[PDB]
Amino acid sequence: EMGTSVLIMQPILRFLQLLCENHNRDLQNFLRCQNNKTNYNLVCETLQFLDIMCGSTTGGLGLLGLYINEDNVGLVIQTLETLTEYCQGPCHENQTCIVTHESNGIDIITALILNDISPLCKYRMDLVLQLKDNASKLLLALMESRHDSENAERILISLRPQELVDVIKKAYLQEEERENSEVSPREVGHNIYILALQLSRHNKQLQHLLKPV
């Protein structure tokens, strides 16, 4: 069972997401920071919550699947969606904060996209597919209009090119899982491949790998 304090986060996360809907830059900036004597950044707290739930470095080291379970998978997806809403618009400051945060949440997002949650996937593939889709959406939003390659460099540091090429190939070959699934694995693979092209524009190895036979 989930504690009351962790439970209350879900309505708070949904409310914050609703505030920043319609790509409202004003409310996104206000949530990130305010013209107040004491400033409290909400996007960093959301990233920290995602990191702690996913295990932070422990999760990013390949143990992400163990921490994620069906009971809190919904909360994980909710926080990922909230981060995506913060990033989209696009918001330069929110994306920079999320990518370059001390908690290293971007590592958790990359592990989520790359490392499948073995326990959840074994009995519920659909939740893992949706979670991967949300993580890919967040990463795409992070580099929606980031001409600078520093964010792409950070992502590549947290994520090797070969693993994206392999993951794209598997997602294309994972279409059989679409049966009784709302989200097509091939669609998620295509989004990941678009993100891979965006990274390849900065990375030569990913560009070479993405080229077909």
């Binding site: 470095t57 422990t58 080291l61 390949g62 143990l63």
Partner: protein, 726 residues
């Protein structure tokens, strides 16, 4: 005054129930104690290096804790947890490097790492303090855990949370998890006299932090007070040594036959440099102008100069360094950076401040009585010679830590030997001895402890320093005592297999494993251990792993085999085989006969005399020919003095049918032929004559031709024919 920073070396002085410095009882023990009688703030304890701690930042043990939990209670999961723990360790190291030099503030988390033992102080909320039941337990842990976290809090109302900690301020150390402040209780340990336990319990005790050394001064490129150094005389290429000659400690220059004088390293040559400071508890990096003292690590005496009996003044060791005589001054032998700090591994010239005389090496030996004197007298003279200069060589902290561990282990094993000699040893003491023996096994083997069985450890390359420490620090002697005392009432060799004696069995196998590991590729240790060959043989035949040590000691060692083997060893072997009538002992004799596939004339002749002597013929099976053309017959006499005679073909038939007695007799006979053949190797005519008299060419041909006999028996007969006759 100054603000305490991360990475500083400080000493804590409690002034609550008992006034004293917190310290440890040793490196093999995990108890922290306070000794009020040891010293005070004005007069620090003589062994001050045991009271020094380093302040370190907060560290993460979550992944390490998960790995430990997994180990306590699949393979891929364990590997992933190990990788996570390693990554956490690396991250902690990087963070500690980052936050190095930061100012400590009240309410923050600080970890105290003991310098001598390199173990973090820890408070366990799941265990009670030994002497005081209500209070929780405090112990030193090398790896560290969450219990090591401590909050530094203001003992004075003037100090407030968030303020910078100032050196010399009384503070309160509160364990984060336990939440009960440390306390210097009044309970006194039974084993140690004058030492009081430190336990976690609500109290009013306060710890006065004293800055022994600043973080900036803690650099390895400079000569720092408290460092252990070696004094090497460049002109004579000798290391200064202090040791007891007849009944008094004397200082001299040891003479070494090694190719490299610097390569000659001994415990007695270790000295500790202490920089004189206004504050008794303050060390810090030294300067050329500053005064210095040198303290003998092993004995604790201080170097000084005294009236020469006849070279006006002579160097000697005095019990106390507080006297002004022990003071010394250093003079550079080369250009220096505007009288900056003394560099590490720098040549210096020593002068006596009180007398204003410079040191000098004299050829007058101190041990002229000895056939080969090795001790050369040193003296201080008013005139200075540029040639006479002593270089200071820094020693790694790891070597000092290993030496201290060796000394403490030797002391504990000596105590255990005394207990065993008394005849009674407690179960907890036995468990502690077992644990220390396992630690010694892993320490000598120089292999990381990753849960592998201690008994079966393989080392790619021996560590010569560890083996030299084992020999010099008397650890091998304590191990020999551990092996000898229990068997001679407390425990019997025949009773070893009993479940009641299982822990003693494990202790003895651990001791023999230690002996085997210590003597790999070492002539001096090989001789020292082989001096107990009789004791090793006495324990042969029981599950004590003595066979492995015996084989390793004499394996591929012609000189050791020749020196340590006499008629007495073969007498013991033949007596044992007569008692047991076991072929394996004849196999041992055969192995003794030949080393490295080459016959050893001396031991070969000794075994020739012993085995072929008219006495002991009962164990030796007899072979004859019966017309019954002629059939080979074997006659054997059992230890009961009963004589049995059976044809070789009949014996083979009985062995084929499964008769245990005949099969055992045939195996003993085969080992007899093996021993005879090894006795006749490399043209040993003395035994060849006797064996030819016993067995002829025709007899061996008949035995080897007959196919009904066992194939291995025919092979042994063919081997004997090849050696003895062909």
């Amino acid at each position: 005054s100054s603000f305490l920073h991360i990475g500083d070396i400080v000493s804590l002085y409690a002034e609550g129930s008992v006034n004293g410095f917190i310290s440890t009882l040793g490196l093999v023990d995990d108890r922290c104690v306070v000794e009020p009688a040891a010293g005070d703030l004005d007069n620090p304890p003589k062994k001050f290096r045991d009271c020094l701690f380093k302040v370190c930042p907060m560290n993460r043990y979550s992944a390490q804790k998960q790995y430990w939990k997994a180990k306590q209670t699949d393979v891929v999961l364990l590997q992933k947890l190990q990788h996570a723990a390693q990554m956490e360790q690396k991250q902690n190291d990087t963070e500690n490097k980052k936050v190095h030099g930061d100012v400590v503030k009240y309410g923050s988390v600080i970890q105290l790492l003991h310098m001598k033992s390199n173990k973090y102080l820890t408070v366990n909320k799941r265990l009670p303090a030994l002497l005081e039941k209500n209070a929780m337990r405090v112990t030193l842990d090398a790896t560290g855990n969450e219990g090591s976290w401590l909050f530094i809090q203001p003992f004075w109302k003037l100090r407030s949370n968030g303020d910078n900690v100032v050196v010399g301020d009384k503070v309160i150390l509160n364990p984060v998890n336990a939440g009960q402040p440390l306390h210097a209780s009044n309970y006194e340990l039974s084993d140690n006299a004058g030492c009081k336990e430190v336990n976690s319990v609500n109290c009013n005790t306060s710890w006065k932090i004293n800055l022994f050394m600043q973080f900036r001064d803690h650099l390895e490129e400079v000569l720092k007070g408290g460092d252990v150094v070696r004094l090497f005389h460049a002109e004579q290429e000798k290391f200064l040594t202090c040791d007891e000659y007849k009944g008094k400690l004397q200082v001299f220059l040891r003479t070494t036959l090694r190719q490299s004088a610097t390569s000659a390293t001994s415990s007695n040559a270790l000295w500790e440099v202490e920089v004189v400071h206004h504050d008794p508890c303050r060390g810090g990096a030294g300067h050329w102008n500053g005064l210095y003292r040198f303290k003998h690590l092993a004995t604790g005496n201080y170097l000084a100069a005294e009236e020469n009996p006849s070279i006006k003044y002579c160097l000697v060791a005095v019990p106390h360094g507080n006297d002004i005589a022990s003071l010394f001054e250093l003079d550079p032998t080369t250009l220096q950076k505007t009288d900056s700090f003394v560099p590490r591994n720098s040549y210096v010239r020593l002068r006596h401040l009180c007398t204003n005389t410079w040191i000098q090496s004299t050829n007058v030996p101190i041990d002229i009585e000895e056939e080969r004197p090795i001790r050369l007298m040193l003296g201080t003279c008013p005139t200075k010679e540029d040639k006479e200069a002593f270089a200071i060589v820094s020693v790694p902290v790891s070597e000092i830590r290993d030496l201290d561990f060796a000394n403490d282990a030797s002391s504990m094993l000596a105590s255990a030997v005394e207990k065993l000699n008394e005849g009674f040893i407690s179960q907890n003491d036995r468990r502690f001895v077992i644990q220390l023996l396992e630690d010694l096994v892993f320490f000598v083997s120089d292999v990381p402890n990753n849960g592998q069985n201690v008994l079966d450890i393989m080392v790619t390359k021996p560590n010569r320093e560890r083996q030299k420490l084992m020999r010099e620090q008397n650890i091998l002697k304590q191990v020999f005592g551990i092996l000898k005392a229990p068997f001679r009432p407390l425990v019997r060799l025949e009773e070893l297999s009993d479940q009641k004696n299982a822990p003693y069995q494990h202790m003895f196998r651990l001791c023999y494993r230690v002996l085997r590991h210590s003597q790999e590729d070492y002539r001096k240790n090989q001789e020292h251990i082989a001096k107990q060959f009789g004791m090793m043989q006495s324990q042969i035949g029981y599950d004590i792993l003595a066979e492995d040590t015996i084989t390793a000691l004499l394996h591929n060692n012609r000189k050791l085999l020749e020196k340590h083997i006499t008629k007495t060893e073969v007498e013991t072997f033949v007596s044992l085989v007569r008692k047991n009538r076991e072929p394996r002992f004849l196999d041992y004799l055969s192995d003794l006969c030949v080393s490295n596939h080459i016959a050893i004339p001396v031991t070969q002749e000794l075994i020739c005399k012993c085995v072929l002597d008219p006495k002991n013929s009962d164990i030796l099976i007899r072979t004859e020919l019966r017309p019954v053309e002629e059939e080979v017959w074997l006659t054997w006499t059992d230890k009961n003095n009963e004589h049995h005679e059976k044809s070789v073909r009949q014996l083979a038939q009985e062995a084929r049918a499964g008769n245990a007695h005949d099969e055992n007799v045939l195996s003993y006979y085969r080992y007899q032929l093996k021993l005879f053949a090894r006795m006749c190797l490399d043209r040993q005519y003395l035994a060849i004559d006797e064996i030819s008299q016993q067995l002829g060419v025709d007899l061996i041909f008949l035995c080897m031709a007959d196919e009904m006999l066992p194939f291995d028996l025919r092979a042994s007969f063919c081997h004997l024919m090849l050696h003895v006759h062909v």
